[PDB]
């Protein structure tokens, strides 16, 4: 059984309204949760959806030179895989391995709907 780290971000991973009524992997719902399900089905393995305590996508603090967040939790062996909207970047690529992107995105402009 592998520990799959994750973050809280709609619509990726969201606490179901009946959170207390459910326990386990069925505590959560979203895009990334079904992605983790499918990934496990294809690879084989079994997992529990742990959530990063800090609730942050990793970053390397220059003063201390330490990794935080999901990237930290993945580099220090606490997690076995991260199924979240982590952005592929050079600094993170040096420290961990990424899969080919499962979702392409970019910067965009939001405005109020014209009325």
């Amino acid at each position: 059984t592998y520990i799959v780290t994750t973050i809280l971000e709609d619509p990726y991973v969201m606490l179901k309204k009946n959170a207390n009524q459910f326990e386990g992997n069925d505590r959560y719902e979203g895009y990334c949760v079904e992605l983790a399900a499918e990934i496990a089905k294809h690879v084989g393995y079994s997992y529990r959806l742990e959530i990063v305590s800090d609730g942050k996508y990793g970053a390397r603090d220059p003063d201390t030179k330490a990794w935080n967040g999901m990237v930290g939790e993945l580099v220090y062996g606490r997690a076995d895989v991260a199924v979240a909207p982590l952005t592929i970047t050079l600094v993170r690529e040096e420290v961990i391995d990424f899969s080919k992107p499962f979702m392409s995105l970019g910067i965009s402009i939001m405005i109020k709907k014209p009325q």
Binding site: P11, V81, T87, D97, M103, S104, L105, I111
Partner: protein
Amino acid sequence: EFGIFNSLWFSLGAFMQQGCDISPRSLSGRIVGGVWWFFTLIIISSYTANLAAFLTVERMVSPIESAEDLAKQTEIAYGTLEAGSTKEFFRRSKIAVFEKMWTYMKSAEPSVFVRTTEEGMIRVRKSKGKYAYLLESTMNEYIEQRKPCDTMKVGGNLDSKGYGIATPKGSALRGPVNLAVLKLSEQGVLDKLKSKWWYDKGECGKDKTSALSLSNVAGVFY
């Protein structure tokens, strides 16, 4: 008696499809009168026809349709989150358009920046279309489909980046996970999931034309 003052009055009355006190009697006066009558008829009918068209179908147009438009215009503000990588993309860009946008955004009073995406979203909402927020496309599309459903994303993406599944550096899961993601992509699973959780769960998936109000004829009264 077509002096100049009476000529002006004849012509004005002809254009307004009011009467005349006097009509031309010569051949030359009647040619002039006749072509001015024809002109008037076409022009007035064109006014009525086009106003009907306008009032029948509403075409609402977004002022902005790209990033270069935010660059060239000045009336609309725009800013990013200080905390995130978006700001950094601009700070180090070295593309002409984005360099210009950075030069603007740095020297902006009051502060174009916000603390959190919620703050930026509220700022965009509150203003009557004078602030545009720059953010990740996926979050943009999500917010667009959520209540109150009063925002939209405009234009293409400014940059290109990806989300991946990460594994520890020495891990044996790497190859299997990679091939799993590719398989899911090619089978259309990922597209389907995105469609489900953005569009199918979307909150907000040309009639009752109104009486003209005093406001859209107030100028004629003045």
